[PDB]
Amino acid sequence: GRDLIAYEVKANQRNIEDICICCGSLQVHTQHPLFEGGICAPCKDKFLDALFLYDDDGYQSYCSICCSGETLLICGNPDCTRCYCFECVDSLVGPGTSGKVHAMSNWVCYLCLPSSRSGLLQRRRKWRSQLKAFYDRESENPLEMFETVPVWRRQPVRVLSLFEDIKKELTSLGFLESGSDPGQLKHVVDVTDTVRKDVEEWGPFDLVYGATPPLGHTCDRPPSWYLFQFHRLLQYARPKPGSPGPFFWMFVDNLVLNKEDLDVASRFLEMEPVTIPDVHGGSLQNAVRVWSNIPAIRSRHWALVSEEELSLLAQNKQSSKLAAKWPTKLVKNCFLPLREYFKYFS
Amino acid sequence: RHRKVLRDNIQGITKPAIRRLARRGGVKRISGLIYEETRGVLKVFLENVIRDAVTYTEHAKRKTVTAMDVVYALKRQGRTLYGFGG
Amino acid sequence: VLRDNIQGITKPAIRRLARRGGVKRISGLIYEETRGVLKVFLENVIRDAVTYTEHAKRKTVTAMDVVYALKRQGRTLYGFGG
Amino acid sequence: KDGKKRRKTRKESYAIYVYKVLKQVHPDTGISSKAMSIMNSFVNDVFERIAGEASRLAHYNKRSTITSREIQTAVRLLLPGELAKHAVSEGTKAVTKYTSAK
Amino acid sequence: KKRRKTRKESYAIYVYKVLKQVHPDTGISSKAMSIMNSFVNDVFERIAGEASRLAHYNKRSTITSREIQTAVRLLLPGELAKHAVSEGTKAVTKYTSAK
Amino acid sequence: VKKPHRYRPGTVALREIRRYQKSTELLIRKLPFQRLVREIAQDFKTDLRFQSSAVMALQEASEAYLVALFEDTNLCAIHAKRVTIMPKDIQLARRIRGERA
Amino acid sequence: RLVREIAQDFKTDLRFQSSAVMALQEASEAYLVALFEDTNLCAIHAKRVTIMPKDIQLARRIRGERA
Amino acid sequence: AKTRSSRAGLQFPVGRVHRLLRKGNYAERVGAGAPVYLAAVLEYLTAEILELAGNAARDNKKTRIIPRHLQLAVRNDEELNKLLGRVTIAQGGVLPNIQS
Amino acid sequence: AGNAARDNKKTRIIPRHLQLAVRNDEELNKLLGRVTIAQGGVLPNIQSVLLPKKTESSK
Ligand SMILES: [Zn+2]
Ligand SMILES: [Zn+2]
Ligand SMILES: [Zn+2]
């Protein structure tokens, strides 16, 4: 029943809030976070879970609006991460349009277009605060929620990379502009003599990234040092309390800190880590723990990944240390939800 | 286009199927975590054999996987199968 | 004299090979067992290695006959054939 | 009479020969087509094994001729135990019969 | 010495030049050189025998770069096969349209 | 009431072991195994097409492989003074075979 | 002397090369080290650390070499 | 017209083995005695398995050899099990062997 | 092998370096699984159950 929900509004003169736009159902628990309308309880529960879940293959593992698995299309403008199913587009705006949308990779999505009224879609003003209230009512966990940054009121990202360079990554990920060096990323190898005055002189920061050494133990400095300095300069770079400004952070560990240091890092960053496994080439390859406040980053950990297998991989990697590249590609993906917060360079 | 992506067919390998394959294997008592591990090992085995057989189909300039390409894919992996043409 | 060359494989030789294999502790019945298995592993090679020497109409078993007898059993050995 | 309706390439086999050998060792026992396909695949498999082993035995000695001696050494390598010790006697008896049948 | 004249071929003078292109100062022993020679002969006979089977399967009495391509896609595991097929295709395309 | 006859956990088990060792039919259901083969084939090539004999050959080879694997798994279970197979036994069997690669 | 005594049975009055006997010793020691690796895994699996002939028989029975 | 099969007292075709040696790109030349010797070896290896399969059929009170009879014929003999150790026979099952 | 030689402070590849080069890589170990390299040895890899517990009781 997907061609009926486009009939209940036009003919019966009913409120969009009184029909579940996901699976076509007539029962409505709450109001939909992104757009005006109602959502049945199972679809509501699953929709929240889908946002948390992170997929390597596409921006969204399951569909945004109705939470379907297949029929995934990509957003035209590369500065947007939204993905919708074919059945939502057909059901709401009209049949035979989903194919047209999927046919090009440069088709401007619903949020990038100047007018957000397509025919059966309504946008929300200052939606992120309402979205935080949505998480507050049922998500049972108040995950770190910074106001969303509009495209019209967008700022150049100011990046502070500590102990590890990400300019290649962010450039590949479209966070840093190539060809022009205004200096929107400062790589700082040594930070022992950094002071609040220095950070204030360096210009205000919006994203501060840090990461542990690669598996070949390049430097002879204890790995907790990277965490503790990352925390310090992080606190320095946080905006003045009582200011509507985004501040994101991410500390990444390639299994170089033991359980003692792991609990210490988890306590200071006030959350449990995120273990990410890499594509199996027969058994298991490598894995990485990540702390961050970036949306849909905590749910990235996969329950299948065991501790003992991880310990064995760590001890086979530490002692062998064949490859010694920082896994930039492993931690490259995790910034993908941040795309809607800063400007993208194609 | 006109091809629905088949999914969750690893659960088509049911619990009594792995039970009967353990009865033929001589196993008297099976633990509860056997079934996920057995699905995973059967999935990796089919990945290896179909990875060979689709490449045999690729070089033959066809779009149909034959029984002879399955026998070649298994005889390459040192598991010679009889009854389908060597 | 012509029977105790299987005991020419000594207890410290099997001790050193099991230390290389990462074995922490060895029981007293390992040494009778391994001398059996190694002996079988020589026969299955030498039965082949003499046979190539039969077909070449030679009397010397060369390194190439050993490399071919191991390659036949899926134990391809490197660094003895040019 | 009807003839040549559907042109199909005659796939060779060993089915009538395995049938002859089975009637020589068991004068009343039949065999299914599935087991006949298994025996056909067995004869193809062991043919490829002994021919490939004889090809390696020919290439190792820098000779470009496969005679009965290369097949004999391939049989002595591939067949374990008494199988080689009887198959070499059967093959040598057959070659002795074939050479002096004129 | 006219009766003492038998030159066995190898791959020493080539693996030495590939080593000097990869590591311009690292050397190699003669035992490791014989191991690299046996490795080149092993992988050569693997890809040649596999391509010969892949020609005989399709009733073709000719080996071209396509049989060697699918033999590399069968014998080499994982990304190693993809990089070897990329390098082989690039070298064949450079070879055909050269001087 | 002691009317409904119930067996021991070591009677019907051995009875079905003797039943399914003397049988030659396929034990995995044909259509879910066929859907699994098609799903695994969709990652390598799109728009494939299987002969029925090819799927039957895959099913014969996969069931024979799993029966041999459960025989080595049963030996690994008995060696640890147990009659219960566990994923440790399957991992040990595929480690000693040399299939952790 | 072990290789010569084992070779006495298949043919009388062999000759060996030094490289052939060294190749046999390289392959035989590598085979035994891999065998004691699987033997040690079989010993660890039975909650022990000491290897036993049961472990060597189990490793060779899972390798499919009991013939 | 006397065929080479009955000239050597064999049953397997000498000519078909001869042209399959010449077709398979094994060597440049193929000897005259080699297909005779190989047909004799294949005939002995066929006759032994058909003898054991006929004995397994007679034990099962059947006059047709099913693939279960070839399975029991190959797996019970230890030299044929060593020959076909890495070979799966379809429609075969396994041996009724229960651990003590 | 040049990386394994540079780790071992040597400017000449010995068969130990080829052994460590092939066996540490997973795709080369899959390629050369049933292959013995002469004068190689094995990987220095000790299991985590045969070591004595070098830990301290928290209580
Ligand atoms: Zn719904
Ligand atoms: Zn967009
Ligand atoms: Zn949707």
Coordinates of C-alpha atoms in Angstrom, one line a residue, chain E:
Chain E
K1 CA 87.6 -25.9 -23.5
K2 CA 85.4 -26.8 -26.6
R3 CA 83.9 -30.1 -25.1
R4 CA 83.2 -28.3 -21.8
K5 CA 80.6 -26.0 -23.1
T6 CA 77.0 -26.2 -21.8
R7 CA 75.4 -23.0 -20.6
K8 CA 72.3 -23.5 -18.4
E9 CA 69.9 -20.5 -18.5
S10 CA 68.8 -18.8 -15.3
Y11 CA 67.0 -15.5 -14.2
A12 CA 69.9 -14.1 -12.1
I13 CA 70.9 -11.2 -14.5
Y14 CA 67.2 -10.1 -14.5
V15 CA 66.1 -10.5 -10.8
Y16 CA 69.4 -8.6 -10.0
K17 CA 68.3 -5.6 -12.2
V18 CA 64.7 -5.7 -10.8
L19 CA 66.3 -5.6 -7.3
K20 CA 68.6 -2.6 -8.3
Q21 CA 65.4 -0.8 -9.6
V22 CA 63.6 -1.5 -6.3
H23 CA 66.5 -1.2 -3.8
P24 CA 69.5 0.6 -5.4
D25 CA 72.0 -0.5 -2.7
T26 CA 70.7 -3.8 -1.3
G27 CA 72.5 -6.9 -2.6
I28 CA 71.5 -10.6 -2.6
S29 CA 73.3 -14.0 -1.9
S30 CA 73.5 -16.8 -4.5
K31 CA 71.3 -19.2 -2.4
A32 CA 68.5 -16.5 -2.3
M33 CA 69.3 -16.0 -6.0
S34 CA 68.6 -19.8 -6.7
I35 CA 65.4 -19.5 -4.6
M36 CA 64.3 -16.5 -6.7
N37 CA 65.2 -18.5 -9.9
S38 CA 63.1 -21.5 -8.7
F39 CA 60.3 -19.1 -7.8
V40 CA 60.3 -17.6 -11.3
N41 CA 60.4 -21.1 -12.9
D42 CA 57.6 -22.3 -10.5
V43 CA 55.2 -19.4 -11.2
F44 CA 56.1 -19.6 -15.0
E45 CA 55.2 -23.4 -15.1
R46 CA 52.0 -22.7 -13.0
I47 CA 50.7 -20.0 -15.3
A48 CA 51.8 -21.8 -18.5
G49 CA 50.2 -25.1 -17.5
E50 CA 47.0 -23.4 -16.2
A51 CA 46.7 -21.4 -19.5
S52 CA 47.4 -24.6 -21.5
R53 CA 44.4 -26.3 -19.6
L54 CA 42.3 -23.1 -20.2
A55 CA 43.1 -23.3 -24.0
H56 CA 42.4 -27.1 -24.1
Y57 CA 39.0 -26.6 -22.3
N58 CA 37.7 -24.2 -25.0
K59 CA 39.1 -26.4 -27.9
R60 CA 41.6 -23.6 -28.9
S61 CA 45.2 -24.5 -30.1
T62 CA 46.6 -21.0 -29.4
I63 CA 47.7 -19.3 -26.2
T64 CA 47.3 -15.5 -26.3
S65 CA 47.4 -12.8 -23.5
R66 CA 43.7 -13.6 -22.7
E67 CA 44.5 -17.1 -21.4
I68 CA 47.5 -15.8 -19.4
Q69 CA 45.1 -13.0 -18.0
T70 CA 42.5 -15.5 -16.8
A71 CA 45.3 -17.9 -15.5
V72 CA 46.7 -14.9 -13.4
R73 CA 43.1 -14.2 -12.2
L74 CA 42.8 -17.9 -11.1
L75 CA 46.3 -18.6 -9.6
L76 CA 47.2 -15.3 -7.8
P77 CA 45.0 -14.6 -4.8
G78 CA 43.3 -11.3 -3.8
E79 CA 44.5 -7.9 -4.8
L80 CA 47.8 -9.4 -6.1
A81 CA 45.9 -10.8 -9.2
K82 CA 44.3 -7.4 -9.8
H83 CA 47.7 -5.6 -9.7
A84 CA 49.3 -8.3 -11.9
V85 CA 46.5 -8.0 -14.5
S86 CA 46.8 -4.2 -14.4
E87 CA 50.6 -4.3 -14.9
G88 CA 50.3 -7.0 -17.7
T89 CA 47.6 -5.0 -19.6
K90 CA 49.7 -1.8 -19.3
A91 CA 52.8 -3.6 -20.6
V92 CA 51.0 -5.2 -23.5
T93 CA 49.3 -1.9 -24.5
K94 CA 52.7 -0.2 -24.3
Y95 CA 54.3 -3.0 -26.4
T96 CA 51.7 -3.0 -29.2
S97 CA 51.7 0.8 -30.0
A98 CA 55.5 1.3 -29.6
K99 CA 58.2 2.1 -32.2

